Copies of this chain bind each other. A is one copy, B any other.
Amino acid sequence: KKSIYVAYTGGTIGMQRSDNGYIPVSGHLQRQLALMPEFHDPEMPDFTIHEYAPLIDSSDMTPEDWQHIANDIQQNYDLYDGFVILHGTDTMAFTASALSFMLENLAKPVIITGSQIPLAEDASDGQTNLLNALYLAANHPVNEVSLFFNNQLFRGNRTTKAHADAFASPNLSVLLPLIVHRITPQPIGVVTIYPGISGAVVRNFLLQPVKALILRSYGQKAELLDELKNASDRGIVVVNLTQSISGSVNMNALAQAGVISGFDMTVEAALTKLHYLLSQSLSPNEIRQLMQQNLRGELTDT
């Protein structure tokens, strides 16, 4: 019989309504699930919940949090058949992409999910999200980092926020020895190019401490290309995402200024992948070459 580890890392799913808003209550999630027979059906896997203290606030969390989640998966990896990571919904897709890069040789399912409402409340998708995540982690395993929301299973490093209040992978079809790499915060600019953006503005985006820049550009101004080439000549890694809802960069003026294509990668995959590559002992050229390679299913280059 399958057994699933559930990491309650943070998010509203396990919290309680007060008048001053949602508040954390130690062990509340498991006490509420003990009252919910759907979770104890003989078709369902066994599962255990561990709670992080303090809970990670997903709107104010760092790459050190990604590391702590990955270390927790690694510690439990051999004891369970699969892993569900409960998380705040607003940066869930960043956590999912980061974990995809950090967990090399992953051969068990890892499903990130959460809910905006405490899971006992009428309007909460908490119960349905956790039930499906548990069931999918046990029985229909894709040995990857996946994300479960709005009733679908997405590939983790292909999901992007898709409504304000909330997930899509616009560039991939929905799905339905463990090595952990180190990751640390990195100074990365993610900027949107628009008509007439000035040299002075772009120059400022490239000041220290920036080590890399993600450009979201259109589906050749001398002063823009000059600043980008100068940045690449001092080792700044510049990645172009043809920032539209869906589709790919096909790179060339940008190429000649040292910009590399991010192909159809989401902002979440590019940002987490640069954190991953900059945190290893790689040179700018090695990072440029690896950013363009499909490392974990995040990008299509034929």
Closest B residue to A58 by beta carbon equals B218
- Give bound CA distance, A228 to B94, whole Å: 23
Identical copies in the complex: 2
Closest B residue to A247 by beta carbon equals B164
A contact residues vs B (CB 8 Å cutoff): 57-66, 89-91, 94-95, 160-166, 168, 170, 185, 187-192, 194-198, 200-201, 204-205, 207-210, 214, 216, 218-221, 242-250, 264, 267, 271
Residues of B within 8 A of A57 (CB): 220
Please list the 3 inter-chain residue pairs (A to B) with the smallest Cβ-Cβ separation, ordered nearest first: A164-B247, A62-B196, A161-B244
- Contact, CB under 8 Å: A162 / B245: yes
- Contact, CB under 8 Å: A195 / B244: no
Whole-angstrom distance from the CB of A52 to the nearest CB of chain B?
Answer: 16
- Contact, CB under 8 Å: B218 / A59: yes
Whole-angstrom distance from the CB of A89 to the nearest CB of chain B?
Answer: 6
- Give bound CA distance, A196 to B170, whole Å: 25
- Contact, CB under 8 Å: B246 / A163: yes
Contacts A163-B246, A247-B165 given; indicate if A60 touches B220 (C-beta within 8 A).
yes
Contacts A91-B218, A195-B63, A218-B91 given; indicate if A188 touches B201 (C-beta within 8 A).
yes
Residues of B within 8 A of A91 (CB): 194-195, 218
